[PDB]
Amino acid sequence: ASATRVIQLLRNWASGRDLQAKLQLRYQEISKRTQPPPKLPVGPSHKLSNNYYCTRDGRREAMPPSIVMSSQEKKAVTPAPPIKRWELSKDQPYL
Amino acid sequence: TQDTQLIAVDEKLDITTLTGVPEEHIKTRKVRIFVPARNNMQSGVNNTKKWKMEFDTRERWENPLMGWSSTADPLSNLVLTFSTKEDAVAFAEKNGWSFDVEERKVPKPKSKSYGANFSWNKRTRVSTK
Amino acid sequence: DTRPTIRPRNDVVHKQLSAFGQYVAEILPKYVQQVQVSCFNELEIFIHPDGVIPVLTFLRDHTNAQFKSLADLTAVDVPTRQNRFEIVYNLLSLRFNSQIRVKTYTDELTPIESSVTVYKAANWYEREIWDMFGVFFANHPDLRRILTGYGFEGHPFRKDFPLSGYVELRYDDEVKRVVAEPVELAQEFRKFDLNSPWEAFPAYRQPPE
Amino acid sequence: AGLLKKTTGLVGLAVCETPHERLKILYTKILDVLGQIPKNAAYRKYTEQITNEKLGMVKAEPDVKKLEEQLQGGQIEEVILQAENELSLARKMLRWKPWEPLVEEPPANQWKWPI
Amino acid sequence: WDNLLAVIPGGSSTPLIPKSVCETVLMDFDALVQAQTGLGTAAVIVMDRSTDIVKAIARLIEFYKHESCGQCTPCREGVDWMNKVMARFVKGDARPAEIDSLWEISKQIEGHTICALGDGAAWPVQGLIRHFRPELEERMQQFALQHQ
Numbered sequence: 001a002s003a004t005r006v007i008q009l010l011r012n013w014a015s016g017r018d019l020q021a022k023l024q025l026r027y028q029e030i031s032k033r034t035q036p037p038p039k040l041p042v043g044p045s046h047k048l049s050n051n052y053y054c055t056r057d058g059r060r061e062a063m064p065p066s067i068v069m070s071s072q073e074k075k076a077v078t079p080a081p082p083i084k085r086w087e088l089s090k091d092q093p094y095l
Numbered sequence: 096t097q098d099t100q101l102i103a104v105d106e107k108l109d110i111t112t113l114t115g116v117p118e119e120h121i122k123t124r125k126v127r128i129f130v131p132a133r134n135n136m137q138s139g140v141n142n143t144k145k146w147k148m149e150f151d152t153r154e155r156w157e158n159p160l161m162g163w164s165s166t167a168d169p170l171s172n173l174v175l176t177f178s179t180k181e182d183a184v185a186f187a188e189k190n191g192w193s194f195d196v197e198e199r200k201v202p203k204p205k206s207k208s209y210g211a212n213f214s215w216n217k218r219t220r221v222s223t224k
Numbered sequence: 225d226t227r228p229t230i231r232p233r234n235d236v237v238h239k240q241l242s243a244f245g246q247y248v249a250e251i252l253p254k255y256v257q258q259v260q261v262s263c264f265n266e267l268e269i270f271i272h273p274d275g276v277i278p279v280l281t282f283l284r285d286h287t288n289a290q291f292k293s294l295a296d297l298t299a300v301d302v303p304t305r306q307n308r309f310e311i312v313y314n315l316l317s318l319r320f321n322s323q324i325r326v327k328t329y330t331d332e333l334t335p336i337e338s339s340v341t342v343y344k345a346a347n348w349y350e351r352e353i354w355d356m357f358g359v360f361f362a363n364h365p366d367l368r369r370i371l372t373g374y375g376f377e378g379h380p381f382r383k384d385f386p387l388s389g390y391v392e393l394r395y396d397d398e399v400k401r402v403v404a405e406p407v408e409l410a411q412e413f414r415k416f417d418l419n420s421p422w423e424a425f426p427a428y429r430q431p432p433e
Numbered sequence: 434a435g436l437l438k439k440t441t442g443l444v445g446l447a448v449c450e451t452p453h454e455r456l457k458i459l460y461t462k463i464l465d466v467l468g469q470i471p472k473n474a475a476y477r478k479y480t481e482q483i484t485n486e487k488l489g490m491v492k493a494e495p496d497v498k499k500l501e502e503q504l505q506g507g508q509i510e511e512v513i514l515q516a517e518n519e520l521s522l523a524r525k526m527l528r529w530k531p532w533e534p535l536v537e538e539p540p541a542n543q544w545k546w547p548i
Numbered sequence: 549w550d551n552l553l554a555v556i557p558g559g560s561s562t563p564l565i566p567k568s569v570c571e572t573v574l575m576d577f578d579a580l581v582q583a584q585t586g587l588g589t590a591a592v593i594v595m596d597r598s599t600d601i602v603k604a605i606a607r608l609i610e611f612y613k614h615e616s617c618g619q620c621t622p623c624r625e626g627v628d629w630m631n632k633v634m635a636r637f638v639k640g641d642a643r644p645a646e647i648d649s650l651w652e653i654s655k656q657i658e659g660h661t662i663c664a665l666g667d668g669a670a671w672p673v674q675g676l677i678r679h680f681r682p683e684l685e686e687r688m689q690q691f692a693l694q695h696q
């Protein structure tokens with residue numbers, strides 16, 4: 001931090017980068033370990049009214065697999081529309 | 096309906112030799128079925144609907160240490176599931192195992208009349224609701 | 225779907241798989257028993273055992289299906305059903321970003337001709353099935369016990385196989401080698417009876433059979 | 434047409450020097466191999482519709498660039514692969530015979546979920 | 549009638565009607581229930597502006613709490629609950645949402661009871677929620693306002 005000036009320029013030169021701007025050891029930027037009491041929020045449905053489980057009962061909303069064909073003019077169709085070709089990233093087009 | 100050199104197998108299927116269970120564990124293991132009786136403290140009924148494959152209980156010696164119930168009965172913890180007894184016995188005979196049967200506990204008709212609970216010449220009058 | 229608890233349904237593709245399900249059903253009605261889709265936009269078309277070759281050869285090669293990514297070769301034991309072993313395939317379409325899933329029924333002995341031709345990924349999966357569930361597959365290049373121990377007995381995921389197993393191991397001085405004694409557990413697996421005797425979901429309830 | 438590309442974007446598959454007329458001749462192949470299939474069969478009525486159409490837009494504009502977005506099959510070089518795959522099927526069910534009805538209904542409640 | 553706050557011409561098991569609506573209504577079984585109130589036994593009880601309505605239902609729900617037999621559950625602990633949350637209403641220990649909750653609670657005890665006492669418990673308090681809502685709104689707002 002730590003190190004002295006002439007050492008910094010030595011490793012700055014050998015790496016071709018400014019390591020003093022950002023390093024890989026935390027010195028003072030670390031958040032304080034003890035923190036104020038974290039008052040948490042409440043649920044979106046936390047309300048004393050109109051929140052019966054008759055409305056939100058997702059486990060109940062599920063329907064057994066809808067059967068269409070059973071052992072006991074027309075047009076061809078696809079399982080999904082064909083995918084589209086992604087373009088080059090305009091940020092870095094060529095590495 | 097499946098004609099590809101089919102062999103007319105007239106003998107009951109015996110897959111016991113493939114599963115490779117120990118010989119002492121295929122003959123000296125009475126295998127039994129029944130549909131569980133409802134837990135009398137729980138009025139719920141959605142458990143007495145399936146037959147199960149459960150076995151006979153062997154010995155349970157206390158551990159010399161703190162006292163866990165050490166057991167050497169691998170087949171004891173083998174509660175299976177069965178939709179019908181016919182499928183239950185089908186599994187039992189397919190790997191031929193010394194087995195016994197049990198009849199599905201069927202409810203009787205509860206003739207209930209709340210108007211009966213109050214009467215003039217009938218003794219089913221209830222003193223307190 | 226203003227409520228944030230349940231996940232929203234997606235109907236546009238929901239109708240699309242059903243249309244594709246009928247599209248597959250009409251082409252090869254000799255092998256498709258029944259086809260259906262679930263709430264979570266997952267379609268499944270059900271095939272006959274001897275149908276492992278052409279149905280996947282269809283999905284692997286069709287210009288309008290082209291499902292080539294073999295996902296998984298699973299099996300599901302159902303002791304009630306006569307053909308307890310249920311071999312389950314799973315394919316993914318690269319161009320049409322969908323997941324087909326075909327499953328069959330098979331007894332302990334009855335084989336399935338190896339589907340390594342349509343997907344060589346199944347080859348390495350195929351070894352596991354005979355190791356893990358024990359269902360032998362016909363004309364398989366090399367169908368080996370590859371994931372369980374050497375010289376194991378039986379098939380552990382048959383629901384008749386104890387969780388603890390049949391043989392335990394220890395190093396024995398008098399033979400200076402590991403000997404496989406029968407299991408003798410220090411503690412017994414304390415099974416828990418976890419089944420509420422009240423109706424769980426009126427939707428998926430089995431009617432009186 | 435234009436300048437022939439050097440890479441298809443996928444290793445193994447190379448740019449075809451003969452894009453359209455090769456695809457056309459193998460397409461005429463998949464018209465004729467489909468011939469020995471009866472008309473009432475569903476795969477015929479699906480295929481010749483999907484066959485006779487994309488034989489159209491290939492001859493609609495011989496250039497490689499526009500035809501990539503005519504069929505949504507990506508680059509033409511993989512359309513050769515996939516059309517060949519469709520050719521493979523027509524040969525495959527020439528012996529499969531997949532049009533007489535379902536072989537046999539499943540054994541009792543062989544699906545039955547839940548149990 | 550100007551100094552009047554609310555006459556209840558049905559009695560206990562009948563919704564209180566505000567003074568303005570009392571000026572324009574016929575008292576028959578039909579017309580009164582058109583105004584969403586009951587006529588019952590024609591127990592015409594008069595209560596004017598000086599007395600607070602929350603205190604009126606305070607004694608009313610207290611009467612119902614001491615008359616329930618506890619046979620059917622929705623009336624037994626239900627009529628207990630109305631008294632408890634309303635007890636907060638009188639002093640003002642509630643919030644405007646809690647007014648909706650007690651109306652929602654009053655919906656639950658409606659009909660589900662063996663007899664009509666539980667239903668008869670709803671009618672007076674239910675009429676309050678629809679009619680004297682601002683009076684309840686100022687009642688529990690004042691408690692918190694001058695508490696600080």
Ligand code: SF4
Nearest residue numbers: 618619620623661663
């Ligand atoms: S509603 Fe009627 S039956 Fe039920 S507890 Fe109240 S008085 Fe008794």
